[PDB]
Amino acid sequence: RRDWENPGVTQLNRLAAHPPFASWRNSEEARTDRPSQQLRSLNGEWRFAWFPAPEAVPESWLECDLPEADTVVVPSNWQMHGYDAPIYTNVTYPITVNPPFVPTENPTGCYSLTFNVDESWLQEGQTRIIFDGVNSAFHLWCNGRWVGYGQDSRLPSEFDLSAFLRAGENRLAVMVLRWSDGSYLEDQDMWRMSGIFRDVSLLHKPTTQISDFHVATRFNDDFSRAVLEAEVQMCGELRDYLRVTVSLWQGETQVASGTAPFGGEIIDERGGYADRVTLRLNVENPKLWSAEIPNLYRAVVELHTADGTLIEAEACDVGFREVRIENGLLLLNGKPLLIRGVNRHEHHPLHGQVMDEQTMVQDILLMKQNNFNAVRCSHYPNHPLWYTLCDRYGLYVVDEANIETHGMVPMNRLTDDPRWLPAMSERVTRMVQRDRNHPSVIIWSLGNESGHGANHDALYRWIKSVDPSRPVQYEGGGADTTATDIICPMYARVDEDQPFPAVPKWSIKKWLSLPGETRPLILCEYAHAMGNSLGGFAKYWQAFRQYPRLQGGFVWDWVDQSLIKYDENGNPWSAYGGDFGDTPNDRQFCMNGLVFADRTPHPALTEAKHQQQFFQFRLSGQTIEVTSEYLFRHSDNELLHWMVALDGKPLASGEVPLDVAPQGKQLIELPELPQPESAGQLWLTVRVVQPNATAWSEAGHISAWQQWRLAENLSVTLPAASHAIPHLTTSEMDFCIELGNKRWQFNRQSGFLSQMWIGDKKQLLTPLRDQFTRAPLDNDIGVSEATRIDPNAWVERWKAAGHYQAEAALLQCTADTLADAVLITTAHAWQHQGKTLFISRKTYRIDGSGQMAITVDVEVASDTPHPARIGLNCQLAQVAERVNWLGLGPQENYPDRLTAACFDRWDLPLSDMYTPYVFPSENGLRCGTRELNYGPHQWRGDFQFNISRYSQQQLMETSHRHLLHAEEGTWLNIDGFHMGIGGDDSWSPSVSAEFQLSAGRYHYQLVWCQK
Amino acid sequence: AALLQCTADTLADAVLITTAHAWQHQGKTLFISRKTYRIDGSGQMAITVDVEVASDTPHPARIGLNCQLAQVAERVNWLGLGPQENYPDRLTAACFDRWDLPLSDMYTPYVFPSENGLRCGTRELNYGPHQWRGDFQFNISRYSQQQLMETSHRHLLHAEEGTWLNIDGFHMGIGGDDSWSPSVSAEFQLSAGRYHYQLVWCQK
């Protein structure tokens, strides 16, 4: 049969899909969500063996353990145990495209388990096994006998073992195929793995049972009244004495309850459903569910006899909430949402695609503390617990069918084929069927990157029909097809159009008002967080805030998909595409997260947190206007703290309780602020603090901030004439300057400050030279390989123009003496193949104070690609423990990623000055610095800088962080100007014009000295 | 203007004058100007200017220099945007090239008088035997900003002795989305706080 190469066959003997069951036999257990005895885990220690193909499987296997098998933990991904390689491919299918066939060499994993079944279970009722996630397809046997088959790796496959079990010891044989025709619908850009990766369990149901239940909450115009409607379906023998009781609880308080025997209303000419019943519960002033206040009720569904005897109980958490699109806006409980979302894969650097509750919880808490309110299940139904936690902590969820056919040509090749409708249908239907009772799910998604075909229209229609409670969205085929209630593009830019044929990506602001367009717009993917990215994040936030119809989006993505590997030494390292021998592969493309695989944030996370803030401020004079973007809660666990500093010197602070209603304003008058004895800029900083701990944060959690410049008093004070004057020692090869214990040397061949001495210690390992390039960010690179270039990538443009290859050609080097200083003047040209790219004119003024003032003026040829930077660099001989500076911080920040940073005086261990992106590049810059202190050195001006033990060249030359080696001394990169980092996407130039170094002429001035 | 410093140095091939001034109002330092004048054996005077603008003072209208030339010449020739009046937020129409007009075309006779005649993106300006080089904006006429500012009807203007030259490293947008509320877009406001420019003044 080769059922795995036939889309017409997606399962054999599978039971119908339904919401989470537990078959309690005690209503209070049910009520309380206590553990149910009728439901048990088979997770743990299994027997497993790997074969290169199903045809290599021995018959005996059904019969008895293979001696050679190994004891492994289940659930797991076999690649995570070393049986074969996990493969990292983005678009290109990991197998030959030739549906519905797969390779003859089709890695097969033979799992088996010997376990005990109790007689009680077999005397009566029904016993089924549930495999939450089996990737990609599998055949099942019990005690030697064949039970069934099943496809779709991301939804539960269930089978009736009732007739297969013996009391005592029993044997399960599970033949899992890596590749099946299902794989053609599983082309997500992530690691390609396989096995029994989700729970395995046994559920006992009575013969007469609750086979399905649907919960609906409808409301009146002002939400003061609601009706909970619950449709209940049974299986088993219908009897007049059978009944259903549905009850609702607000905690320990029974809110409502209703009983009725079976038998639905007339549906049509043949009658109604004798085996179903609907209960309707009225609720006055229900407590509404939202991400803001995840108010939940408990619903208990009891199947019993008229005399009070309980057959079984099922139940679920209930959130009263209404989701609907009206007059072009996405409304929740009548209020238009603002989606602060993130896409999230189920990824563990260790466990692979196997998810655990702790990681889930950790993810949710990180999201929430980062001002995230929504998440998209990119790109398939998640492990069942996910929804529960979302229901509980409060996160809006986009539930997505497990359908992605990215690598077909064109993309809709299958989705437009009616012969694929069936397999596709199951992936949609079974999801709705399973998750339709979770309040957290607010939108259904048809899948991802599978073009736009008729199959999508049909399914779009199916959902609308069966679950009018939620909007359906789908980005394929253009983001605004007839199969979507939401314009939900990926990577559409704020102001910039990308008019690709057939599927253009217009500026979001523009998209909304195209002739006849009326839908709301929420990006299904945006601000591609790969490596040093998120440049331009603020531009989106501003726009979302300004246009009602721009209702946010889901950033791409939450966590880097790196996997842990170890070196000889046994030490762990983060791996990516191709690191497992996988090929073809997409290398680092699998790392686009806001946090590293271990959940350590990337610096971009903070930029995301600020921009997603729920309080907005405005300052007028001494008056602060706080505005709340909350729709539902008041600011009841918040205080505003503020503080005034002069140049980092704290001059005054205070707190102020916040008392703003959802969407209201609060003014805060700052008390007269004293006068600073002293030149400089006064800076106001305000943070919103949570005094009390929550379910998602601890007391003192900071949820928002903002800063402003208050008055400024320019300095009009004269240095103060210095006692001594520096001495100029000319020479054939060098201009030397001495001043006390200090010496500066300028190599006349080169035109650069070759060395400096304090006392008898040399200061530099490498001369101080201009720098116009940077170790390329993932955004600079784009898809620019070896096999294939991509001309347009910044990195390509730079390479090609000679940027990395240009060497300095002296044009002038002189020295003069002034009344109180020596003046070194230089001019250099940077050429490539006869083109002068840049010209650097400088002056060094060393005075009686021993301060060297450097003035730089660079000219950039207009027809050369705008440089990554305009600064200087050198290798210092020293290695200090800390870095202290007066500027933007404390975290890494770039020009188009600097809103979250604050201007103040920061001090960190040098290590905190380097950012450990798994794929190395220019990192750790800090902008708007007026003063930098390191070792004996002090630099002052208004520049950007980074400082670490790794040079630009090393960075650019090393593919993996674990391979970096601290160099001798410390590398300092100090820039007058630094180019934006971009990120609207990572595969095309995304650095906005205002952040490009196009001026042609730049001036900067630095003062170097010893403190 | 409050002089903070003024000095003279002798170079290999030149004399260097270094100055610094503080502009204040009611005890407030509004702006700081720091310069060097470098005259070499070639007769070229190179002016380098660095200014600081208090962050809490309103963004200034322009950052430049000005002076009344003794001389009155018939034409003005320049290498930059033109030939007509052009401002920062109103210069797309203008073209960069070599322009040469009668002095008078360098003045815009708006009925209600104001700053006018500016030309941006100039690399070279020649008037009489004078010549200025760099990268700036300038205006030149027989009318001071003060006159312009005190006279409300163009007919009431009177040519002053000599020619007033306004050379700017920087000039604020003129606006106009409306004429009754501030309309200069932020990108056209002189809010950077620190400004630098340099010009070469010489003869020919």
Ligand SMILES: *[C@H]1O[C@H](CO)[C@H](O)[C@H](O)[C@H]1F
């Ligand atoms: C949106 O694009 C990103 C690119 O890293 C991923 O491929 C997503 O799965 C896709 F839907």
Ligand SMILES: [Mg+2]
């Ligand atoms: Mg099949």
Ligand SMILES: [Mg+2]
């Ligand atoms: Mg894809």
Ligand code: NA
């Ligand atoms: Na909006």
Ligand code: NA
């Ligand atoms: Na990716």
Ligand code: NA
């Ligand atoms: Na690199």
Ligand code: NA
């Ligand atoms: Na006037």
